[PDB]
Amino acid sequence: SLSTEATAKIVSEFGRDANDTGSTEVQVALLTAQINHLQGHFAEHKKDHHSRRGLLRMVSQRRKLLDYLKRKDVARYTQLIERLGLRR
Amino acid sequence: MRHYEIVFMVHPDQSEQVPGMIERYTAAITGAEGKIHRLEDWGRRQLAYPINKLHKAHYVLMNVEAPQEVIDELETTFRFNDAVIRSMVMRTKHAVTEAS
Amino acid sequence: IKVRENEPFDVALRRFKRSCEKAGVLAEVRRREFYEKPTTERKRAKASAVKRHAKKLARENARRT
Amino acid sequence: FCRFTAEGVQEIDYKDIATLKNYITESGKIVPSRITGTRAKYQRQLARAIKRARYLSLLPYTDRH
Amino acid sequence: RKQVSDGVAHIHASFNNTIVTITDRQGNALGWATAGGSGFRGSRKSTPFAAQVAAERCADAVKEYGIKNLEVMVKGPGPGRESTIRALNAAGFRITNITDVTPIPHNGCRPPKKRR
Amino acid sequence: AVVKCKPTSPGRRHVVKVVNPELHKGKPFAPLLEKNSKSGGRNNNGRITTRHIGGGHKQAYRIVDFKRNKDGIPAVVERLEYDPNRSANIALVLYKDGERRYILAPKGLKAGDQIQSGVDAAIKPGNTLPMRNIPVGSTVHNVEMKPGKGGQLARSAGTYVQIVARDGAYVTLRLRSGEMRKVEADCRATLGEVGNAEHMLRVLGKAGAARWRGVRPTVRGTAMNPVDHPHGGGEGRNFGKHPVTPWGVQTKGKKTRSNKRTDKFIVRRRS
RNA sequence: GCUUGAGUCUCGUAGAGGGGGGUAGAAUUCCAGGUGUAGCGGUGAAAUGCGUAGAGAUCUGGAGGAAUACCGGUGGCGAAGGCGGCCCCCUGGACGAAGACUGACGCUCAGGUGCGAAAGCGUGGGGAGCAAACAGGAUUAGAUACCCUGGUAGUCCACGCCGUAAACGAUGUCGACUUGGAGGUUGUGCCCUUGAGGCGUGGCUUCCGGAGCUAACGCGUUAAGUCGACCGCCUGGGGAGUA
RNA sequence: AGGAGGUAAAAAUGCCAAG
C-alpha cells in the first residue's frame, strides 16, 4: 500500500528535495508510515500470517537502518526518532 | 475513485419500472462526485438457465466511477430490492465507454 | 451428450458422449478421493508422455526393417 | 495450431458471447488450450470470462438445465 | 387407459443392474422392467444381453398406451446403454432423440474409499 | 468477556465471570422501575407449586418495551444497562420527543446508535418491522405471536429466530429450539440477535452463587423415603423403578404437549 | 570518500500468496407429493440391508451441509507447511523497463522469537457425504482383516492448544566462476506490426547431456563441478531416540 | 502423437518347511 501521493508527502518532509528518495531519513520514515498504517489491519484480521511476515520484514529493515544511522551520525539519529516517536 | 462495472438483471414483471430504477441509482452515484461512463440497457433477453423459475430477465449495464462506500450501499440496495434477481460488480484498469 | 441429427437416424453412433466423457469422469469419481495420488499419477502421466516424445525423436538407428 | 488475441489483440471481455461461444463445447464445458492453441495467458483470461458469463446466465453451465 | 402417443424412455444403466422406465413427457411413469426381473439374478444381470431383454420386457408393458415416439434418456456407467437402446429400436418405437443425463457433480461430495 | 478467576479460595477456583465493561455503572433510570416482590414458588393457596425457588437479592422490575409500537420517531441508544430480570441486557433509548424507554439490547449495539420502529424503518439491527416487510432469510428476535400483543419469542441472551419462508398471510419461523413454527405475517420483530451472547459461558462456582440467584437445593428423588417420592427407599442405595416425576409420570422421554388448539401453527416439531 | 553489493522512489505486469464478507451452479442425502410396480441394493459369488406399511425408477417442490467438474498444464504463487468456482474489501511478496537517490547500510546466526500438513485435545456451533471405533453379513482351518450393509468420534466453522511427518529436490543459507541442446512460463527492447514473424535482453521453471565430480547410481550453470563466509550435524550395529 | 475404451480387463481363498 502507501499510495503515491502519501509517499510524496513523506519524501519531501525528510529528504533534501523531491528526487532525494533513498536517504536513510526518508526510508526510515517511509517504513514507519507503512508500519503504523498496518496496525489497523492486524488489530482486525489477526490471522493474516502471510501478510505479517511482510510486516516483520519492514520492522527489521527499519531497525537495521536506524542502527546504521546511529553509527554514522548520532545527531540526525536523535533528531529522527523524536520526529516519529520511536525508541521504546 | 475506483471504476466499477455493475451489471444487474431485473425481474421481467418489473421491466417497465427499470428506467425509474436507473436515475435513483445514478443520483446516488453522481450525488457523491460519481462519474458515469455507460448506461447501455440490454432490454429483455432470454436466460440460459432458469433463475427462480424465470426466463427472459431484463439486463442493465452501468460502468461507473465512484468511491468504495458509495457502491456499498448500492450493493445493499440490490439485496433488498426484490426486482433485481442478481447483480455482479467488477472493477477498473480503465473506464470503458463501449458497446456489447 | 444430446443427439438428434433429425432425419436419417437408423443407428445410434454416439461418439458424442465419448467426445465428452462416456465413462471418463464417471469411472473416475466412482470412488477414492486419494488427495495426493492424483499428484503422483499426473506426474508419471506427464513423465511417460515426454519420455516417448524423446523416444520417437530417437528411433533412427537402423533396426533393419 | 492457430492463434487468438496474440494477433487480434484483446483483453478478453466476458460480454462478448459471440466470441466466447467458440471456446466452449456443446455441453458447455471449456475447451482445453491444447485444442484451440490459445496462449496460456489468454486461456486463463477466457476461463474467468466464461465463469463470469455463466453467473449472469449468458452462457449455460451444462446442457442439462 | 390414457393412450398417450409420445413418451420418454429412461435407462438407469448402473454397474450391477439396469432399469428401463418408460414415462410420458411430464415424467409420470407408465411401466418398467429391470434385468433382475427378467431372471438373471447375479452376474447375468450385469451383461448387455440382460439389458436387452429388460427393454423388450418393458416394451410389452406399455402396449396398452400405444406409444410410437420415444425419446431416450440414458444414465449410468453400466454395460446396459448401447444395447438397451437397440432393443427399443427393434421393438417398434421411433427414436426421436437420444441424450445422456448422467449426473456428474461439479466436484463436491466425498466418494467412497472402497475396494482394496 | 469471560474471565477465569484465580483460585485463591475453594469456590473461587472454578468461577468464570462474564463481565461487560460497557454496562452503565450507576443507578438505573428511576421512572421505569416498579417493585417486584418474590414469591418463593407459592400461589394464592400459599402452597409451593414450583419447587426450588427461594431467596435472592430483592431485584426490581424494569419496564421493557416489548411492543415497540412508537413508530416513525427515531431513537438514540443512551446507555446499555444491566437487568436482573433477564439474561439479556437492556438499552435505555431516548426518542426524539424526549421519551425514554427500555428495550432489549441486540448484539451489535452501543451508545449512540440510532434505531427506529415502524414499517418504513431500515434493515438494521435494533429496528422493529412487521414481518411482511423483513426480507426472508433474516435473523430477528423479539418476535410477536399475535399482532400488537408484545414480543414473546427469542428474548433470552444470544437468541434469534430465522425467517424461513412466507406464504402471503403467514410466515414460517425456525425457532431457536429447532421447531419450525408458523406465525402471522403482520407480527412485529426486531432485527438481529439478542446481545450478551456469552451469558452461557459463565459458571457459578459456588453453591451460594446459585443460592443468591434465587434457586434452592434440589434433593434427588432416590435419597428420599418411599412416602415422599416414587423413587426412594431401599436398604443401601437401590433404584428399580422407571424414572418418574414426584407425582409419578414418566420423566425420561414422554411427550407432554397435548394442546390441539395451536397445533395448526407447528410445521415441524423440535428434534 | 567511491559505486558494482544491499536498499528507496517513479511506471507497469503476472499469480489457487494471505485474511474478511457475499454469492453461484452441478451432485449426494433427507423431507413432502404425483405417477407406478415388484423388486432394489450389493458382490468373485452371496447374505446382512431396503421393499406390497408400496421401495428402487421417474417428476415436481423444499430444507440443509460440504466440495468446487470443464478450464488444468513436470502451469502459477508462497520462507516452508501449503494455496483451485465467482465477486468485493483489506493486505504481503516477486519481477521488468528507464532514470533518479542513499553510500557497504552487507552475509551468516548458538541461545531467542514466530510460522508450521494430518491426526489429536479444549469450549461453543454445525453435521449432507465420507468414515476410526463398533455392529451385522461374508470369506476362511481361524479372520478381532481385506470385501459387503450400516455407523459414532472425526472430517466443517469460530477461538485456543499441540509442534510432529518419507515436514523430501531424503541435497542449510549467501556469493562468485565454469561447454551445450530442447521446452514451459512471465516481462521487455529493436526492426519492415508490414501477418501469426525477425532480432535481442531479464526473472522463474522442466527435461536431456559435456567437462568435472562421485563407491557407484547418478548430479551436471537451479551442481552432488571449482571456490569463499557462517551455521546445523555425524563417529559400528542392537539396546534407543529408550530409561 | 496423446486420449478413451473394447464377449473383454482381472482381483474368491490359497499357510508352513526347521542344521
Curated annotation (Swiss-Prot), chain A:
Induction: Part of the metY operon that extends to pnp, also has its own promoter. One of its GO terms (molecular function) is small ribosomal subunit rRNA binding. SMART domains: Ribosomal_S15 (SM01387). Keywords: Ribonucleoprotein, Ribosomal protein, RNA-binding, rRNA-binding, Translation regulation. Pfam families: Ribosomal_S15. InterPro entries: Ribosomal_uS15 (IPR000589), Ribosomal_uS15_bac-type (IPR005290), uS15_NS1_RNA-bd_sf (IPR009068). It comes from the Bacteria. One of its GO terms (cellular component) is cytosol. One of its GO terms (biological process) is regulation of translation. NCBIfam families: S15_bact. Belongs to the universal ribosomal protein uS15 family. One of the primary rRNA binding proteins, it binds directly to 16S rRNA where it helps nucleate assembly of the platform of the 30S subunit by binding and bridging several RNA helices of the 16S rRNA. Binds to its own mRNA, stabilizing it 5-UTR and preventing its translation. Part of the 30S ribosomal subunit. Forms a bridge to the 50S subunit in the 70S ribosome, contacting the 23S rRNA. This is Small ribosomal subunit protein uS15. It comes from Escherichia coli (strain K12). The gene is rpsO.
Swiss-Prot record, chain B:
GO terms for cellular component: cytoplasm; cytosol; cytosolic small ribosomal subunit. Keywords: Acetylation, Ribonucleoprotein, Ribosomal protein, RNA-binding, rRNA-binding. One of its GO terms (molecular function) is structural constituent of ribosome. GO terms for biological process: cytoplasmic translation. The keyword Transmembrane helix does not apply. Transmembrane segments: none annotated. 5 different forms of the protein, varying only in the number of C-terminal glutamate residues, were isolated. The sequence shown is form bS6-6, which is the longest. The first two Glu are encoded by the rpsF gene, the other Glu are added post-translationally by the RimK enzyme. The modification N6-acetyllysine is found at residue 93. Belongs to the bacterial ribosomal protein bS6 family. Binds together with bS18 to 16S ribosomal RNA. Part of the 30S ribosomal subunit. Interacts weakly with uL2 in one of the 3.5 A resolved structures. This is Small ribosomal subunit protein bS6. The gene is rpsF.
From Swiss-Prot, chain D:
Pfam families: Ribosomal_S18. The keyword rRNA-binding applies. PROSITE patterns: RIBOSOMAL_S18 (PS00057). The keyword rRNA-binding applies. Keywords: Acetylation, Ribonucleoprotein, Ribosomal protein, RNA-binding, rRNA-binding. GO terms for cellular component: cytoplasm; cytosol; cytosolic small ribosomal subunit. GO terms for molecular function: mRNA 5'-UTR binding; small ribosomal subunit rRNA binding; structural constituent of ribosome. InterPro entries: Ribosomal_bS18, Ribosomal_bS18_CS, Ribosomal_bS18_sf. It comes from the Bacteria. GO terms for biological process: cytoplasmic translation; translation. Binds as a heterodimer with protein bS6 to the central domain of the 16S rRNA, where it helps stabilize the platform of the 30S subunit. PANTHER family: 30S RIBOSOMAL PROTEIN S18 (PTHR13479), SMALL RIBOSOMAL SUBUNIT PROTEIN BS18M (PTHR13479:SF40). HAMAP family: Ribosomal_bS18. This is Small ribosomal subunit protein bS18.
From Swiss-Prot, chain E:
GO terms for cellular component: cytoplasm; cytosol; cytosolic small ribosomal subunit. GO terms for biological process: cytoplasmic translation; translation. InterPro entries: Ribosomal_uS11, Ribosomal_uS11_bac-type, Ribosomal_uS11_CS, Ribosomal_uS11_sf. This is Small ribosomal subunit protein uS11. GO terms for molecular function: small ribosomal subunit rRNA binding; structural constituent of ribosome. Has been predicted to contact the N-terminal domain of IF-3 based on footprint studies; exactly how IF-3 interacts with the 30S subunit is controversial. The gene is rpsK. Located on the platform of the 30S subunit, it bridges several disparate RNA helices of the 16S rRNA. Forms part of the Shine-Dalgarno cleft in the 70S ribosome. Keywords: Methylation, Ribonucleoprotein, Ribosomal protein, RNA-binding, rRNA-binding. The keyword Ligase does not apply. Belongs to the universal ribosomal protein uS11 family. The keyword rRNA-binding applies. Part of the 30S ribosomal subunit. Interacts with proteins uS7 and bS18. Cross-links to IF-3. In stalled ribosomes contacts ribosome rescue factor SmrB.
